[PDB]
Write a protein that binds this ligand. Structure first.
Ligand SMILES: Nc1ncnc2c1ncn2[C@@H]1O[C@H](COP(=O)(O)OC(=O)[C@@H](N)Cc2c[nH]c3ccccc23)[C@@H](O)[C@H]1O
Ligand SMILES: Nc1ncnc2c1ncn2[C@@H]1O[C@H](COP(=O)(O)OC(=O)[C@@H](N)Cc2c[nH]c3ccccc23)[C@@H](O)[C@H]1O
Lengths: 330, 330
């Protein structure tokens, strides 16, 4: 109990600082006293066309980064979404309890639709949050740790679970949403008002965990700041400075107000230099672990096989409970 | 091979003459030389709210009517849609290859949306044809026998299969659509220009297989005809007369032109009387078999268990083929 669920799409060869600090860092803090299911969501990945060889490789490398970021397979369950049929079974049912207008109002859908273009927009891009709701509800999940960009989808998940329970009392757990304050949004280093994301345009403002560390350090030294020459935490008026403090605090464990106090009299050169140095120290051990998990794959394959078995054992019972309440012949 | 697939929704306590003559009659003719999968589609049924006790009972009674209409479990596979997870797995994938505009243009969606009302319209009503495409493609289906009302959905299924195969050559079988000419649409007896359907308003023009036969005979004697006093086959100008000839021909096996020739000099009283008598002879053996399958349920439960096992063995391999082509970790 204190059951928790969270997922990441295997859409690129590396997670970025947004994923690591907005999500996985909180997962690591929760796994020792929460029963945790961490998922690589390859079914969601194909809502955009994906190269098959890359998709398989990136599924593994995403799970590898979980382990390398501190996720403990002795304490948590790591598995691949497509390997547990219950997700799509529950997604079908929950679609029958999701409003069409409700789904069309999701920001992601609109943004994603704009990038793909219309009549090229597919049903899967539209039903995305219904499958996401199924991912969570299948495990009787009590809490979902994510970044801010996932909030609207999880509010749909809660709404749909409540609507289902309205007709079938007590069937699904309504999950609580757990979104950290400081790292809810890590921002792009070149446009500190946009969240760090792979669809940025160029990756000059994007910090990939597995990129050459000297390259990430360069990007950080080039981060956009302001003209004030005052290191002070204020996301609204000082986006780039605040984001750098956020990042350095998150990867070092030093509170911001302590960093800010310790930065009195310093310029932005030292803020960027120190943040770059802290990030390099952060990613070097991650990369070492990921390299070994990739070169010696049997360990990670055993973890995913074990995780799929345990995820199937839990999620299939949820489906049978839901199917029984609906009145399906069993 | 000559693999065939078809389904009926368990949405009422009885099939009607449309279902029996537009679909199941052709199934019976195909099953001896075609490898056939006949499905009770309970996942589709819940795209509209369903009473659970009724839904379970009607799932059984729909499968019972298959057997009572002549479907042979020694030659064909009968099973319940929800009992085979592969259907929802493939539905998710096919949604990723279905256009949003494409789905919104389905007539059923629009009609069904109009009856349910908007913002009360759900995602499942919208994704209905994607799951229907999955039902068919999961079994490498070569031919699909249905009535005319299913044509537009199966053209989507073919379009989506072709689009998928475009990226992943040779993965899915593109099915042919098999829609009979004479019984493509059985029309309501009180409004012979509308197809016989449960959403008619009143059931005075609807012939349920399992209704009291004297009641169905009454409805037929009250069928709307015309003022011509000439028994002649012409669906466009003589809808009610043509529909009655269609029905009597289909349940007796007598060709229409032979019935029409034999009706020279007769009025519509004899057309309705004879059609009512033929329908009573048609439904009485069906009802006898359905009553026994309901009172002694172990036989039908064994048929559905066997069918689900065989359907799972086939459809799960299709899913694994599709998953492999997409590049999912297996
Ligand atoms: N710049 C950023 N700052 C802060 N946090 C960020 C940033 N970018 C990403 N995140 C967080 O990282 C996690 C994974 O993001 P994805 O885009 O893979 O995230 C996604 O695409 C989801 N649909 C995956 C998903 C599928 N099913 C689920 C069930 C529960 C939770 C999540 C899921 C997320 O927590 C996200 O909030
Ligand atoms: N008045 C009529 N005249 C002639 N034929 C008719 C009439 N009314 C119904 N039919 C036919 O009966 C079958 C079942 O209809 P449903 O409404 O259950 O049919 C439905 O609701 C489908 N979505 C079920 C389905 C789900 N998956 C599938 C895959 C293949 C084929 C069918 C399906 C159909 O063949 C239908 O054309």
């Amino acid at each position: 109990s204190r059951r928790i669920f969270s997922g990441v799409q295997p859409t690129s060869d590396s997670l970025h600082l947004g994923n690591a600090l907005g999500a996985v860092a909180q997962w690591v803090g929760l796994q020792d006293d929460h029963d945790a299911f961490f998922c690589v969501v390859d079914l969601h990945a194909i809502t955009i066309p994906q190269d098959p060889e890359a998709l398989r490789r990136r599924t593994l490398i995403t799970a590898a980064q979980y382990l390398a970021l501190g996720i403990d397979p002795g304490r948590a369950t790591i598995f691949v979404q497509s390997q547990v049929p219950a997700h799509t079974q529950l997604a079908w049912v929950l679609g029958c309890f999701t409003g069409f207008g409700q789904a069309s109002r999701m920001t992601q859908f609109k943004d994603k639709s704009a990038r793909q273009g219309s009549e090229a927009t597919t049903v899967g891009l539209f039903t995305y949050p219904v499958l996401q709701a199924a991912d969570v509800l299948a495990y009787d999940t009590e809490l979902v740790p994510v970044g801010e960009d996932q909030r609207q989808h999880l509010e749909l998940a809660r709404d749909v679970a409540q609507r289902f329970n309205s007709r079938f009392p007590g069937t699904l757990v309504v999950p609580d949403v757990l979104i950290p304050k400081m790292t809810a949004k890590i921002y792009d280093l070149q446009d500190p008002t946009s969240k760090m994301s792979k669809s940025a345009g160029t990756d000059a403002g994007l910090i990939n965990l597995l990129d050459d560390p000297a390259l990430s350090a360069k990007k950080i030294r080039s981060a956009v700041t302001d003209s004030e020459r005052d290191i002070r935490y204020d996301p609204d008026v000082k986006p780039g400075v605040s984001n750098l403090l956020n990042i350095q605090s998150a990867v070092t464990g030093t509170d911001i107000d302590v960093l800010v106090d310790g930065y009195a009299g310093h310029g932005y050169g030292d803020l960027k230099k120190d943040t770059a140095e802290a990030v390099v120290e952060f990613v070097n051990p991650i990369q070492a672990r990921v390299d070994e998990l990739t070169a010696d794959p049997a360990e990670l394959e055993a973890v995913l096989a074990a995780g799929a078995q345990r995820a199937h054992d839990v999620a299939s019972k949820t489906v049978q409970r839901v199917y029984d309440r609906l009145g399906f012949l069993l």
